[PDB]
């Protein structure tokens, strides 16, 4: 049939990362766990018609927002399309609990199933929760947006809105096109770079243990994450050393609870080199990071190991960890890591028409087991630490107990970096 021929002729293949997302989503086409979402709280007055004009401009500028997915013989295909969208504006200020009402509205959306061929794949909404307090809600399916991409979009919307508010022309966007990102990925899939990367990871992981984990069971994730959130003063570094510390601390904690001495963690990374640093879309990967719990090691030796792992492996970060699992001949369902340490050193602050604003994550993708999410504006004296967990594997209270124990443990670690991790009392 000519209609199938025309679909193939007018579309692009999924990238490697998108393909892994599509396959995972196909296993549970009703699981909403492939959404990411956040809201930006603005301390001021937002004019919705100007905000919507800013969103129209950024939907033109970031063409990943206009991707449409179409089923095909060779699987899912995509093109720059004409997605239907609107921007709900809800004034909740007369409600008994406007904040709770806003959270419930956002939650109702990000729990909605997202059919990839019908969309909508993103949602933008404005919620007024007090006099001079607005929330801009942002939701994406990860097949077309990752964390850094969402950050780029929020920065650009704030800038464009600010220009439109003051009646000036926004300076030209520095975004590249998603089609260039897809073409570069297609070339990488058949490049020599990829073969070197594959060799590196096959060597690095070639003798693997079943992952160390705090859970009594491992299970696919079907449900949205259980989340425990704690805010931490930084007195308890740059992004790289914050990641070194967080991975070392989580590995030491896993070792103290399970005794496992070969600890493999997941390290989400941006996979954004060169031009791809300016293209909103889905690029990110998650790397296996191995830390060997030796007899007597302290925090310093562990962060030494983590720094070495990152210096050795970040250059090879393009190689998808799912492809790595297949190439290693791992059994179906078996993972290289259970616990992931997702450090997001992305500026949380924005300015909208001269009004201060801050970003707050709602969903950060699927929680297969446990994910430590760390949100830090570089330079700030404050961290947000999320424990995101598979509800099939943890309880809210058990997760909260783990998070309190972990926060205390990590503070005692940072208090004396020469002290043996075996010598530290926990909270139990
Ligand atoms: C809607 C709300 C949003 C929801 C969020 C969505 C959540 C998701 O599921 S998506 C993932 C979100 N998380 C992230 O993006 C994680 C970001 N964090 C990280 O990447 C790691 O924690 C972190 C901090 C260690 C990365 O450190 P970083 O310094 O940025 O490393 P990175 O730039 O990637 O690579 C550096 C290394 O790459 C190597 N490299 C190879 N080629 C190059 C090249 N052309 N250029 C530069 N470096 C290169 C180098 O060896 C380099 O090392 P060095 O500069 O010292 O010589």
Author numbering: -1 to 234, 240 to 431
List sentences quoted exactly from the publication behind this structure.
The incorporation of an acyl into peptidyl backbone is usually implemented by a starter condensation (Cs) domain, normally located at the beginning of the initial NRPS module, via the formation of an amide bond to the α-amino group of the first amino acid residue, a process also known as lipoinitiation. Similar to other C domain structures reported previously, RzmA-Cs adopts a “V-shaped” configuration and consists of two subdomains (N- and C-lobes) each representing the chloramphenicol acetyltransferase (CAT) fold.
To diminish the reaction rate, we made an additional mutation on the second histidine of the “HHxxxDG” motif37 of RzmA-Cs R148A to create the double mutant H140V/R148A, which finally enabled us to obtain several crystals in the absence or presence of substrates. Although their overall structures are quite similar, we noticed that the electron densities surrounding the C8 acyl chain (but not the CoA portion) are much worse in the H140V/R148A structure than in the R148A structure. These results indicate that the acyl chain of the substrate in the H140V/R148A structure is more flexible with H140 mutated to valine, again confirming the role of H140 in positioning the “donor” acyl-CoAs.
